[PDB]
Structures are given as C-alpha cells and as structure tokens.
Amino acid sequence: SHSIEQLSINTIRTLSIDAIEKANSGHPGMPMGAAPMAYTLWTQFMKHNPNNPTWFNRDRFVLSAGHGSMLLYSLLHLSGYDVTMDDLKNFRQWGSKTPGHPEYGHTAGVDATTGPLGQGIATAVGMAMAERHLAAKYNRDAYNIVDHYTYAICGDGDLMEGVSAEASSLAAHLQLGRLVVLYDSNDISLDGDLNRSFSESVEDRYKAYGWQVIRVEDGNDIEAIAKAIEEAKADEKRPTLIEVRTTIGFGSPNKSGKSASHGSPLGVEETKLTKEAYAWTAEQDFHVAEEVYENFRKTVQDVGETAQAEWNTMLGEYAQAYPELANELQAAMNGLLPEGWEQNLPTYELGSKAATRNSSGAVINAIAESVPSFFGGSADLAGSNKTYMNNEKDFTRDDYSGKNIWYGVREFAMGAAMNGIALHGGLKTYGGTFFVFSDYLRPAIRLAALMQLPVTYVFTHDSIAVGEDGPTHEPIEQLAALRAMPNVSVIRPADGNESVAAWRLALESTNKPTALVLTRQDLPTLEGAKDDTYEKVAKGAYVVSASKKETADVILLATGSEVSLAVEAQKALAVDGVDASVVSMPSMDRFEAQTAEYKESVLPKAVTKRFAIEMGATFGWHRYVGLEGDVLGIDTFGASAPGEKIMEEYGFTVENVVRKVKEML
Amino acid sequence: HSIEQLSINTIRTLSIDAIEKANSGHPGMPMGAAPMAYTLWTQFMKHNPNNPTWFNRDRFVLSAGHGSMLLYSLLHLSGYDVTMDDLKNFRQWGSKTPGHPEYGHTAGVDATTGPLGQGIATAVGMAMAERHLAAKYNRDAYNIVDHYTYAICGDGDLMEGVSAEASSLAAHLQLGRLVVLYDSNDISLDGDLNRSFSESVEDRYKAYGWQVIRVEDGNDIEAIAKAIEEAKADEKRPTLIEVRTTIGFGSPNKSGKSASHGSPLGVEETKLTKEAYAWTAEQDFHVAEEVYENFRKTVQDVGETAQAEWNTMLGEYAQAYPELANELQAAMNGLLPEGWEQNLPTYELGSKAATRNSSGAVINAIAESVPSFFGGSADLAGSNKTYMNNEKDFTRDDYSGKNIWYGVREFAMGAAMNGIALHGGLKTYGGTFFVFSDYLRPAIRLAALMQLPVTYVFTHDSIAVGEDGPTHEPIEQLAALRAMPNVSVIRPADGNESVAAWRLALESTNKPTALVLTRQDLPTLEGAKDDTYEKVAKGAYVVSASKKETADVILLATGSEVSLAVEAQKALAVDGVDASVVSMPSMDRFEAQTAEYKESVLPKAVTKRFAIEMGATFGWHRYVGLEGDVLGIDTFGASAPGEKIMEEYGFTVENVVRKVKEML
Ligand SMILES: Cc1ncc(C[n+]2csc(CCOP(=O)(O)OP(=O)(O)O)c2C)c(N)n1
Numbered sequence A: 001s002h003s004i005e006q007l008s009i010n011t012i013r014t015l016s017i018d019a020i021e022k023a024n025s026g027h028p029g030m031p032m033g034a035a036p037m038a039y040t041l042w043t044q045f046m047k048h049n050p051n052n053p054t055w056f057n058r059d060r061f062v063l064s065a066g067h068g069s070m071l072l073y074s075l076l077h078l079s080g081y082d083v084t085m086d087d088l089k090n091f092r093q094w095g096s097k098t099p100g101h102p103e104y105g106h107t108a109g110v111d112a113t114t115g116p117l118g119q120g121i122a123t124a125v126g127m128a129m130a131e132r133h134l135a136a137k138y139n140r141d142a143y144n145i146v147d148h149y150t151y152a153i154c155g156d157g158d159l160m161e162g163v164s165a166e167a168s169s170l171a172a173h174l175q176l177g178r179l180v181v182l183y184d185s186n187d188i189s190l191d192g193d194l195n196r197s198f199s200e201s202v203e204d205r206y207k208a209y210g211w212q213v214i215r216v217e218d219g220n221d222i223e224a225i226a227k228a229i230e231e232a233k234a235d236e237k238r239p240t241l242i243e244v245r246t247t248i249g250f251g252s253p254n255k256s257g258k259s260a261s262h263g264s265p266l267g268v269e270e271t272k273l274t275k276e277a278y279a280w281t282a283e284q285d286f287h288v289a290e291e292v293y294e295n296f297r298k299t300v301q302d303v304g305e306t307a308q309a310e311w312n313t314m315l316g317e318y319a320q321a322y323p324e325l326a327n328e329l330q331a332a333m334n335g336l337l338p339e340g341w342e343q344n345l346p347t348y349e350l351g352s353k354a355a356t357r358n359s360s361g362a363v364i365n366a367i368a369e370s371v372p373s374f375f376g377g378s379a380d381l382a383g384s385n386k387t388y389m390n391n392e393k394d395f396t397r398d399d400y401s402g403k404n405i406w407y408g409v410r411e412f413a414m415g416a417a418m419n420g421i422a423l424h425g426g427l428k429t430y431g432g433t434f435f436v437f438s439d440y441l442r443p444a445i446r447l448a449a450l451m452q453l454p455v456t457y458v459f460t461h462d463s464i465a466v467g468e469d470g471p472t473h474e475p476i477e478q479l480a481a482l483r484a485m486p487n488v489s490v491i492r493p494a495d496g497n498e499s500v501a502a503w504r505l506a507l508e509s510t511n512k513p514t515a516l517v518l519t520r521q522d523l524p525t526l527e528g529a530k531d532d533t534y535e536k537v538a539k540g541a542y543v544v545s546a547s548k549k550e551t552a553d554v555i556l557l558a559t560g561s562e563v564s565l566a567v568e569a570q571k572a573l574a575v576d577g578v579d580a581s582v583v584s585m586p587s588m589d590r591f592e593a594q595t596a597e598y599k600e601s602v603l604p605k606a607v608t609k610r611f612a613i614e615m616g617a618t619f620g621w622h623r624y625v626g627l628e629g630d631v632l633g634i635d636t637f638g639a640s641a642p643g644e645k646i647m648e649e650y651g652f653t654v655e656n657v658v659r660k661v662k663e664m665l
Numbered sequence B: 001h002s003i004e005q006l007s008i009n010t011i012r013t014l015s016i017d018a019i020e021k022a023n024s025g026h027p028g029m030p031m032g033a034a035p036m037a038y039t040l041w042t043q044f045m046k047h048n049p050n051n052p053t054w055f056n057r058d059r060f061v062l063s064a065g066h067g068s069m070l071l072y073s074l075l076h077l078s079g080y081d082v083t084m085d086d087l088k089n090f091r092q093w094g095s096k097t098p099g100h101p102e103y104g105h106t107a108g109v110d111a112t113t114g115p116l117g118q119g120i121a122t123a124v125g126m127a128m129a130e131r132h133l134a135a136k137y138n139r140d141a142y143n144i145v146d147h148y149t150y151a152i153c154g155d156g157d158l159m160e161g162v163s164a165e166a167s168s169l170a171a172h173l174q175l176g177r178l179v180v181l182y183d184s185n186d187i188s189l190d191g192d193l194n195r196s197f198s199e200s201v202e203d204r205y206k207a208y209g210w211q212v213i214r215v216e217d218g219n220d221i222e223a224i225a226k227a228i229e230e231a232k233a234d235e236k237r238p239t240l241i242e243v244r245t246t247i248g249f250g251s252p253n254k255s256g257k258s259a260s261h262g263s264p265l266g267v268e269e270t271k272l273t274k275e276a277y278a279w280t281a282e283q284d285f286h287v288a289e290e291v292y293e294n295f296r297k298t299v300q301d302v303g304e305t306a307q308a309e310w311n312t313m314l315g316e317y318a319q320a321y322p323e324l325a326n327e328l329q330a331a332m333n334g335l336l337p338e339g340w341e342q343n344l345p346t347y348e349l350g351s352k353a354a355t356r357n358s359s360g361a362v363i364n365a366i367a368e369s370v371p372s373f374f375g376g377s378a379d380l381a382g383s384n385k386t387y388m389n390n391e392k393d394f395t396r397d398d399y400s401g402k403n404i405w406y407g408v409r410e411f412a413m414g415a416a417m418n419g420i421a422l423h424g425g426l427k428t429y430g431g432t433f434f435v436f437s438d439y440l441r442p443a444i445r446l447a448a449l450m451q452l453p454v455t456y457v458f459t460h461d462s463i464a465v466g467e468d469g470p471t472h473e474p475i476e477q478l479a480a481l482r483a484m485p486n487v488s489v490i491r492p493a494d495g496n497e498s499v500a501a502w503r504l505a506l507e508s509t510n511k512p513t514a515l516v517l518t519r520q521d522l523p524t525l526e527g528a529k530d531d532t533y534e535k536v537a538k539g540a541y542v543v544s545a546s547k548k549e550t551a552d553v554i555l556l557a558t559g560s561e562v563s564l565a566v567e568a569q570k571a572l573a574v575d576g577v578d579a580s581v582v583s584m585p586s587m588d589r590f591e592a593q594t595a596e597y598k599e600s601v602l603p604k605a606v607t608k609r610f611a612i613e614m615g616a617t618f619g620w621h622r623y624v625g626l627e628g629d630v631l632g633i634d635t636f637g638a639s640a641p642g643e644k645i646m647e648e649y650g651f652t653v654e655n656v657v658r659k660v661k662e663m664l
C-alpha cells in the first residue's frame, strides 16, 4: 500500500530495526509484527498529549512485552514526545533515554517499567482500578474529571506467567471495562515454536474469567484492529483482550515467523532484504519522511492538545462548582498529605500490651479518617492482617468508591496492582499478607523499588511466634531478603508506639516502597520508645535503654519483638555487674543513612562487645556486631507448636541471652 | 447406616476432636471433603500403609494443606504409622502431626504443603516424573512404573498464579494420570468467595485442555466414584473433578461460612455437629473396630496385594532386562554410577569460558554418564545453556525425552522440580536468568524445607548482562538465597570451579543447590586448576597466596570477581602491599568447615580484609568485619554494554587498589 498509514507503520519498523542494528543488541521481531496494531491504537484511539506526558487524565499505556521497547520509543519519537532521534541512536547505551527495556522516570511518556514478563498486565490492572476509584470519588454532575482508558500490549510470554492470570481474574471480577489489552499473538517464544510449551486456548481462558475477547485474524489489517478497539471501548462491563494474529519479524524473508527474529539484530544483509520487502527505498539509516511526522502531528499532537485544553477548561469550571473537592483532588494529584493529618494518630501508654498488627490496624483506621487519598487491602487475609478500614466500604464492581480492596489469594497480582495504583497518581496505597508470603510478590516489590514507588506493605505474622501453622508459615530469611534489596525501607517496630512512627514514615515516603514487619503476638509498651518516638524511629536505630556508665560493657542490639527481651536481659546482666546498653534498630536502611557522628553515638567504635538478638536469619548482622560480637538468630526453619514453646526452644529467653553474652565477654 | 458413612463420619469426628484438643486448626474442609477423600483413598488409590515409600504407589498431595487433619485421619485409620496418640498431639511440639503436612516428618505424607497453589504444581511435577520414568523403563508388558497422581485442592489454590502455570503445562504435556479433586465450597478465609473470585474455573480448565467433571453433591460417594472412574478412563487429559461441598458440613451454625475454615468449632458446636452426624460415641477420639476393619480390607489388604504382584513382576522384568533393572534400582536409591565423574571437562590454563558455557558442557557430560538426569529451562534454554544436545524433548508424543520445555513459567518450574525430586528416580535441574529466581522463590523455600537435592541453573548473574538493563541485572539475589536456611549457593570463579560446583550439586542428597553463572567469558585461574573439587568443596580457599606467611591484606571475591582480585593482588605487590586472595564460591559450604580450616583461610590476626563482588554488600561483614571493607553494588544496574557498567560501578583494578590502600 502507498497510504500514509502504511508508510508510518513501516517507518516504525525500520526505525526499530536500524536502532537495534546500531546498538547491536535488542529485539526486532515484535516491533516488526506489532507495528500496525500499535500504530492504530496510538493514532486512532488513545487520548494523549506528547507535550504533556504527565497529563493526569491521559489514557495510560503499558508495554507489558518490554523487550519490544523500540516499538514504544519509535512511537514516542514520531509522535513528538521528548525522545529525540539522537536518543534512538543511543538505544541501549550508557545513560541514554532509551534503555533496553522501558523505564518509568527515565523516558518521557513511559508510564511503567516493564521487562519482567506478566507484570505489565498486572500493573495495568492496578492503574485501571485507580482510575475507577478516583472517578467514583471525584466526578460530579457533568464533570467527568477522571475519565480515561488503560491500554497494554502483551505477548505470549506475558500470558504464560501466573501473575497475569491472577490479575486477569481480578480485573474481570471488578468489571474493569476501561482496561483493553492488545495481545501480539505470533506463535513464537524465545526458544522456538510456541507449540513446544504452550497449547491452551487463551481466548477461552479469558472468556472464562469474564473478559470480552476479540480476535483480529490479520495483524497487518489496521481497519480490523480499529474495529476491534472500537468494539472494546463500547463494552463497559468487561475488560477486553484483543488477540491480534501477527507474524513475528514480519518482512524478513529469512527470519519472519521464527524465534531467530525475537532477540538479536536482523543483521546487515537481512536488514536490506527486509527493507526491500517493505518497498522501503531510503538508502540512509534512521530515515523518516516529513510527511510521517506530519501524520503523527495531526493524529496525536493536535488531538491530544485539544483534548487537554478541553479538560483544563472543564477542571476550571469544576473547581468553581466544587472548590473543596477540587482542592482535595489537586492536593492528591500532587501527593500532598493534609496539614495536621498526623495529629490523629494513636499513642500507647506504659503498662499496655498490643500486637503490632493491631497497632497497625488502629493506625490504618486513623489514616483512613484523616488522609482522603488512602486506598488498599489484603490478599484474602484482611481479618488476620488487620488491614481493614472499618468505616469505609468495599471496592467492588458495584461501588468503585469503596476504599477496601479484596485482592483474593493473589499476592503477586496485588503487589503489581499496587505499583499501577501508585503510578496512576492521586492515591496512597498499601497491601497486606503474611510476611512469609512476601516471597510470592517479590518481583513486584523489586519493580516498586526500581520505579521508586512509595507503596506500603503490611506484612504480619513476622516470626516463629506464629506457632501452630508451622515452618511453611514462619518467616526466617524474609527480613534479610528485603534488607539486601536496593531502595526498599524495612521497618520492624518494637511496640505500639514504634509502629505508629513506622506507619508515619511509610505514608510520608515519596521515592521508595516501605515494608512494615508486624507481630501476631502482643508486645509490651517500651519506656525507652515512648517519648519522641517518631524522631527515634526515623534515625533507624537509637538507644532504647542506656547503660549506666558512659562506656557500656556490652551493647545489645535488637529489633521488633526482641527489643523487650533485650531490655529484660540488660536488667539481668546488671545484677551480675555487666553494664549493657540496649539499641532498638527498627530500620537498618534508615540507620545507614544517618551521619557518622550519629552512628558513633549509638554504636561507639570503642565498644566491640556487641550482641544482636532477632528471630530471623543471622545474615547481615555482622555489619553491626563485627568479628568480636555475636548474634542470637535462627538459621533453620521453624516448627509446629504453640509459639511460646518454639521461642523457648530456639533460645529466645532471658537466661539464654545472658549466657551467650557472658561467653562472649 | 452403611459402613462407608460410618467411616466417613469417623474421619469427621476425629478431625474435629483433634482440632478441639489442640485448640488450633481448620475443621471446615475435613468436614466437607471427608466423603470425596474417603472414596478416593479406599476405592481408587493403590497404596500400602505398611510400605509408604513403595516406588509404584499412587501419589497423593493435599494441596489445601490446612485440611491436614483430613489426611492424618485417613493415614491413622488406614494403618499407616500415625497413631491415636499422634492425633492427640496435633500441632504440638515434636509431634508427627504438624499443622500443615510435612514430607519426611510423617509416614505416608508425599509432599509438604501449606503455601497455596504449590501443591497442585508439585503434583504436576510428580506426574511428569512418573511418565518420564515409565517411558524410560517399561518394556513390553512390564509396566514397572505405572501409577496415578492425585491431589485435593480448594479455591485458594486455584486463585494462585502458580497453579495456573502448572495446569497450562500439565495440559500441554497431556498428563492424563494427574487427577485433582477440587473441594468447591464457595468460601475463602475472609468470607464469601464472591468478594474476590467469580471466574468459571471449569471453563478455564477446559480452555487449558483438562477434562472437567462436576460432582453436584459432595456427600454422594457413588457420584464421586463415577467421576474418578471416568477420570482414569481418559488417558490424554489431566482431570479436574469439581466437587460441590458444604464447608463445615454438619455444623448447624458454622457450615457454609468462613467461620468454619480456620478455628476449632468449639465445645458446644462440636456437640451439635456430632448430633447432626447421628454420632453417639460418648468418648472423644472414638473409632469402632468395624471402621478399622473397613480400611484394613479396602486399603491395607488391597495395597499389600498390589505391592506383592508388583514385586513379582519386577523380578521377572529383571531377568529380561538386568541392566535396566539394575539402573532403576540405583536411581530409586539416588545412587550415581561408579566413575560418572571421569567424564567431566577440564579447562586448561590460557583458556576462556563463560560459566554458563562450562555449565552447558558439564550438563552434556552428565547426560552421557548419569542416566537419571532430567531437566530444562523456563523458555531460556538457548541463553541458559541448559539443553542436552544429544537427547530428545520431553513431550506428549515422547515421554522418554529428557529436555523439558517449561515455557515462561518460572514458579511452576520450581514447584514441578520439587515434585520430580519427591517422586524419586531422577536427578533434576531447571534454568532461568538469576534475576528471575525471584519468581520461583517460594518453591526454592519448599525445596529447602523438604530437603530436596534439586539444582537451579541461574545464568546472567550480574550487571555484566549489560544492555537488557536493571530489570535484568541481579543485585540482591545472592544475599536473598544465602540467607535462606538449607540452600547451597555456589558462584564458580571459572570453568573448573563450575565443574566442581556441578559435581557438588549433583551429589547433593538433602538440600537444593543454586548455581550462579556468568553470561560473559572468564579466564581460567591458575589457583583453581589443581584439586578444584576439594577446594570448591571447602566453600572458600586461598586461590592466590600472599608472599609472606602473614599477609598485609586479604582480598575475598567470588565468581567473576576472583580474576579481578588476582589482578589487584599483582598490582598491590608492585606498590609493596602483600595480599592474599581467597575465592569463596560458597559461603554456606565454608561456614560448615572446622574452625581450624576457616582460620587457615581467614586468619584472625589479619583484620585488613576487602571483599569484592558484583552484588549487594549485605552479608559480607561476616568476613570483612568492622575494620574491613567491601566493594559491592547497593543500587540497581543500568542499560549499557556490560563492560561499561562494570567500569562505571568501580569494578576495575585501579579502583580496587585505590580502595584497598585507603583502608590500610
Ligand atoms: C519473568 C520473565 N521470565 C523470562 C523472561 C525472558 N523472556 C523475555 S521475552 C521471552 C519469550 C518471548 O515472549 P513473547 O512475548 O511471546 O516473544 P515475542 O514473540 O513477543 O518476541 C522470555 C522467556 C522475562 N523477560 N521475564
């Protein structure tokens, strides 16, 4: 065809190919197969403004098949987003705006970081949830202030991953009809023909969840794809999967339809044969005709600027009609917590006892009253995790204004949805499960950390104290596994007051996820934690119980439920003439950020007798106790028995702490 | 009423009484599932309570692990080594009846469960092993390996992504000997299933390619028996039998409510329930002799007979195929063939190899010399170098193939590997990029807990991966596994270390081994060349000695950073600093050595210690102490040629030297 549409589509293909050739690295097959569908979505259906890529009401887009990144970068560049030709010529290079997989925060117009398969779809589900929640909270009368779609492109690999199955079940249950996923269905995986590992009916599975499924038989037919997208948008009650049958590496005589086109450059000669197949006559690489830029200018820039202008005008009128509502929305879009929200938070008195899951619950209910942007839930453990907002309604297909989310037994989808909710903007979000099952959502926590998303995890039942449910349900290594990960704050509060401070720090976060590690069992309120708690916990470690002498005989370090044990041990040590300091370390990461002077004041370099106590793996503790110190931890799995019995047998008693401290002196 | 109904109500009352006594546990599912489970156990399953490890028994996985009293009741009543006193010690310290089923702890328990989703996926792995072994060993009418794999699961299992992955895989492989009974009761832990779950499970399973059979009344054992018969008759598709039950059936006030899921019924409710069953036994934990006799006839005698017939056939088979039979006997016992290691490669000085490639060379050497080897990759065979080039693919058309194509299903691969190892007869491995070890982490955890000697081939271990960028570059993955109890983590420094590491992985009997391997070529190290197996077996060793008996500094490194450390040693010597270099391929193996050995490697008198590893610094202070330092990476990576990232992140001789001098 000689149409401008076909030329634009082939420009996307050749730009992707040429950038991959020049990098000598990347994935050309999918941009070649998927260019027509993506072009159709991008220029004929999506509402977006290249000049304002963070427009709050733009249609969102997730490239779940992140390896196809050049498809996205081509579209951004061609459309007038701030991705330049020189940027494309630096694909996969040090410090470029065009990294091998899409990275939120590094490239204008990229809505989510993808690459790990499956998560893109689950993240988009979260964005769609956020859109409906915000629309229900803020829209009034004729002011459809929040009103947009959520689009994704995925491939076969995405649909094999369990996290996409979870997310797709959840999305159908919530009737998220503004979620539309285009599935690049090309019968090919990295290792070879898809039929060597996969033969299910994706269409029937999705209908079984409750999705609308539309098939496009010829992926090069943009009229068919446009009809499908129009059909998807007219269905209001079901999320839609459009299965678009394409040829991977379309155009390549020798690589099309083969896994060879998936994951490395076509090569010099194959590239020429491919351009020949496209009737692409340009002799120079990275060629774009001005009329292609003009095509995108009319269909994307002009349309998106008009849409944004009309939205801005409406927002002005909305703000006149509903000043307080509009003001709350502006604050939420900007991630601002209401002045004084924290004055609402609880305080635990001396001589009181409370599990930190319960103080966490009390805090969640205090936040729900004072922070209108709060939105979250649990993976089918609301009662156990204590995450429920008792004065709020449930988020359901029938009431999107409800704040309580029922994720079901879907930890990984929850973790990814939370990222989508945070990416959308407007909401402060959290999700709960047992700490032991944090492992189920680990890859999504890793994406939150990389994307710098201030989500909050409520991880309860943090130790062998869990008791009867046994070793499959008792965390051991989970703390270390999170503490080692870049850009994740891990806070394990020692009592009710430390937990209030920990939640405060989680809610105030702007650039990193925060994992709150909480007990099933009641903890006593600590005298040393009671005053100035927020400032103490903010330091990460502090002296919870001072020694009598300026220079201690020994320093006891402990976290969470072990701080009370360490304090009891300090008392018993003092009877025997050993003068111990006790340090509560609710957060190693926050402590490490403190000044050398502060750290020296808590852990003086002159005191080398140091004993750490924590019901979790010993891994990582020698950073603080050193070669001459010691650690009472747990480096085996747990047991099935009443929790107090296990704790006793595993050595978490005053008598045992005292003995081990003396052996070390 | 019938002896069947009596036996069933006995299962129900024993479960309730044991949970009452423990004041802990989940009674609802035992109550609802007792009839279906009784039917399976006594009418279809072939098993010998007297010999619970019989190699050709039908395997059983209670995927809904919280219903554990259901299993303990059946085991006890059937004559397995689970006593009445054991039942009376449900959930107590040291008992044989822990809150969730624990393989290796309790006679007759085939798999540890509790983490939802994984039971089903583990069962898929057991089914794969059964067909692979059948294809390899059966000849003519000697069906030596010929049994079923059954599981019971609930709604929670079927919401988890891992069960979805595993079911897609099981249908693709046409595992018709896998039969899953789905206790479908409309309730999850937090209340009505319809608060979070409304999909058609039956239609989803049909879409995968499973046979699906509905039983409308979970109390109708004749209908349940018909469904299982129909399941067994269908040889090409795995079967899901959706059994519609009432959770906590029999309880006037808790039946059909989440209230019966996870707490004891309570004293008063237990009476009302027992009244509902027309159960008139005045004493707790009561079993009529006629119930024991029912199980003796339908389970013990049947299973004894089946095992004896199997023994007879095995003997006859061995006369016709002595080599095969000897091989099977050794494999069932986890024995590796005498001299199998003579076959392994050796890397000469002056040669270069990526450790993924040396791993692939070893994989192909093992395939030749160890007949029990069986494994694959999660759609990364080409990149992980896991493929056995002289072997066929494991498919629906040829179960004898050794190369498994797991597809993009890391978690199900991990759980399937556990099932393969549980079955017995096979040494198994699975590969993916190390960065995606995170996707199968909960299955690694169950391998460690169950003590299964599976092997993970984790390639592309660091920022050296390069252009694919930070989502594909491991940072914290080493620490995250090193911290886990009972997991061996080995990061070989060159081709020879990798050969030794594979040998240690294959020889394992009681813990999983993670092999951490490079995309990029590494040089062969002089100090690793001789006695490599014994050196790597120690976990850490001096790869390049200092000149003096007491070094000025110790450089510690692992994997790809050992060559850098040796280079740095050379540079330091020129400036009058005498360094010792220690290669630490495995922290866990070093930790297991004597204090005497450790002192020989990291003498306490040398406190100037500097560790180098392209990963998180977390954990290194165990070795470098408060006075030492570490050059690691505590941020995410970047998209660029791998050598550029390595330079920018400070992994150069010049920077190592600079920093070492700084702490002197
Ligand atoms: C969780 C995860 N596992 C494995 C991979 C490696 N990987 C990237 S693409 C792919 C298979 C190709 O998927 P598909 O989208 O079907 O390929 P296409 O036809 O789109 O090129 C694999 C195994 C990954 N990126 N993420």
Ligand SMILES: Cc1ncc(C[n+]2csc(CCOP(=O)(O)OP(=O)(O)O)c2C)c(N)n1
Residues within 6 Å of the ligand: A379, A380, A381, A409, A437, A440, B028, B029, B064, B066, B114, B115, B116, B117, B153, B154, B155, B156, B157, B183, B185, B187, B188, B189, B190, B247, B261
């Ligand atoms: C991975 C994981 N997440 C969460 C849990 C906690 N949990 C156990 S059962 C359950 C609800 C599942 O209900 P189902 O298995 O259908 O119970 P039934 O009605 O069969 O008793 C939850 C959230 C778990 N065991 N594993």
Ligand SMILES: [Mg+2]
Residues within 6 Å of the ligand: A155, A156, A157, A184, A185, A186, A187, A188, A189
């Ligand atoms: Mg594909």
